[PDB]
Amino acid sequence: NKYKRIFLVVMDSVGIGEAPDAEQFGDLGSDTIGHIAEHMNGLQMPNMVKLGLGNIREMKGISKVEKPLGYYTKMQEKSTGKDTMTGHWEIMGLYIDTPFQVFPEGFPKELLDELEEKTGRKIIGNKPASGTEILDELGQEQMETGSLIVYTSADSVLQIAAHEEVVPLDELYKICKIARELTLDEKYMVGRVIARPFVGEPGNFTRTPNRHDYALKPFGRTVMNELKDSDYDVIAIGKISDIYDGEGVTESLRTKSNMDGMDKLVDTLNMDFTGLSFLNLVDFDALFGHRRDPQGYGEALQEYDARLPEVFAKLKEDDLLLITADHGNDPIHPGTDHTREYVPLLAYSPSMKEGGQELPLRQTFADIGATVAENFGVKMPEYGTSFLNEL
Numbered sequence: 001n002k003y004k005r006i007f008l009v010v011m012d013s014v015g016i017g018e019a020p021d022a023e024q025f026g027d028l029g030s031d032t033i034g035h036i037a038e039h040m041n042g043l044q045m046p047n048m049v050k051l052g053l054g055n056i057r058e059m060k061g062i063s064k065v066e067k068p069l070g071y072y073t074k075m076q077e078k079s080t081g082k083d084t085m086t087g088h089w090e091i092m093g094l095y096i097d098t099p100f101q102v103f104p105e106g107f108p109k110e111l112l113d114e115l116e117e118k119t120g121r122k123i124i125g126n127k128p129a130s131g132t133e134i135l136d137e138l139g140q141e142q143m144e145t146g147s148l149i150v151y152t153s154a155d156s157v158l159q160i161a162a163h164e165e166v167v168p169l170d171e172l173y174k175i176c177k178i179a180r181e182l183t184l185d186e187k188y189m190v191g192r193v194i195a196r197p198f199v200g201e202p203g204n205f206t207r208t209p210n211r212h213d214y215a216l217k218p219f220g221r222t223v224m225n226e227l228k229d230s231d232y233d234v235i236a237i238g239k240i241s242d243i244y245d246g247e248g249v250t251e252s253l254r255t256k257s258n259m260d261g262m263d264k265l266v267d268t269l270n271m272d273f274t275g276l277s278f279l280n281l282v283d284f285d286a287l288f289g290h291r292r293d294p295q296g297y298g299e300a301l302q303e304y305d306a307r308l309p310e311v312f313a314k315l316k317e318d319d320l321l322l323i324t325a326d327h328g329n330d331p332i333h334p335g336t337d338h339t340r341e342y343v344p345l346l347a348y349s350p351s352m353k354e355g356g357q358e359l360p361l362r363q364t365f366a367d368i369g370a371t372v373a374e375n376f377g378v379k380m381p382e383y384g385t386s387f388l389n390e391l
């Protein structure tokens with residue numbers, strides 16, 4: 001094998017400019033990194049610059065270098081949707097025709113009607129809201145009526161909140177499983193159903209750790225499945241295990257923040273493994289992209305960049321570092337949804353003694369999966385073209 005360990009980092013939502021098919025999505029003009037760089041009066045990302053980020057595209061404060069540390073290009077998404085699951089499933093070798101839906105105006109009446117019909121309970125709320133906002137507003141009504149608070153976020157989720165002393169936990173879980181079945185329907189395909197039990201009294205409600213998620217498995221066996229089946233390590237960091245519903249995962253490391261994510265990445269560099277360490281840095285998307293906060297996004301990008309030299313120092317000759325994203329989420333764009341953008345690709349190993357070069361544009365995110373598969377000698381995915389030989 002060319003590399004003993006591959007470290008794959010998804011900077012969630014860190015797009016590098018509108019894709020050729022952005023118009024279809026109402027995403028003309030989108031540019032996640034570029035608009036952030038303009039907001040910041042120049043982004044300070046010297047380490048990503050050293051890798052070749054500016055060689056992909058020059059942006060304010062992000063210039064090309066003559067000798068990038070590794071190879072660089074961008075990737076184009078082939079799957080229909082621009083959600084996190086689609087992006088990640090494509091990265092790991094799939095093609096996803098059916099997009100996961102978001103619900104800025106709540107769920108269709110047809111779906112909620114069937115959920116009421118199957119559960120024998122009324123549904124209230126039906127809007128995007130934070131857990132805290134929706135409980136403050138509707139918690140008391142929920143307690144008094146035995147209704148279900150159904151809500152969403154800016155992502156593809158359906159959340160059901162019920163008080164633990166009013167709706168027994170096992171009943172809430174049964175209801176969520178019903179909702180999970182009803183939402184395997186392309187009219188209202190949600191990525192994730194989430195049980196949101198809460199306790200307390202009016203003016204003092206708190207969600208409990210009895211939260212449970214109901215995810216969909218990837219629509220196909222992924223490169224991760226193939227690595228696991230061939231007795232390789234597949235270490236998932238952060239949201240990765242959840243995104244793939246555990247498929248192909250041999251170890252999962254929970255993270256609480258981007259900095260904690262980098263700490264866990266460092267933890268994996270310190271581990272003797274053979275296979276894949278796969279990190280998702282979610283703060284970019286969750287805290288900054290969706291909240292349309294270019295300042296916070298810029299600061300987070302600078303915080304992430306400052307962590308990289310330690311990663312560079314720990315990489316061995318037979319390690320490969322891959323840095324990419326799963327879509328865009330331009331924090332100066334209308335609405336609250338993701339944006340259809342190219343994503344950067346940087347590929348670096350210390351064994352690249354004369355630095356890197358430009359790779360041909362990756363025509364599907366599955367080029368990553370194909371590269372990982374070829375490296376480890378496992379079954380090649382149906383989609384994707386490996387760039388292993390180019391490195």
Ligand SMILES: O=P([O-])(O)O[C@H]1O[C@H](COP(=O)(O)O)[C@@H](O)[C@H](O)[C@H]1O
Pocket residue numbers: 129130131132153154155156157192286
């Ligand atoms: O909590 P996570 O990280 O699993 O994230 C989950 O809940 C969040 C809501 O958080 P809240 O209602 O507390 O503001 C959603 O944005 C996210 O799509 C969902 O997967």
Ligand SMILES: [Mn+2]
Pocket residue numbers: 025026027028333334335337338339
């Ligand atoms: Mn848009």
Ligand SMILES: [Mn+2]
Pocket residue numbers: 012013083084085087285326327
């Ligand atoms: Mn994402």
Ligand SMILES: [Mn+2]
Pocket residue numbers: 084154155285286290329338
């Ligand atoms: Mn998102």
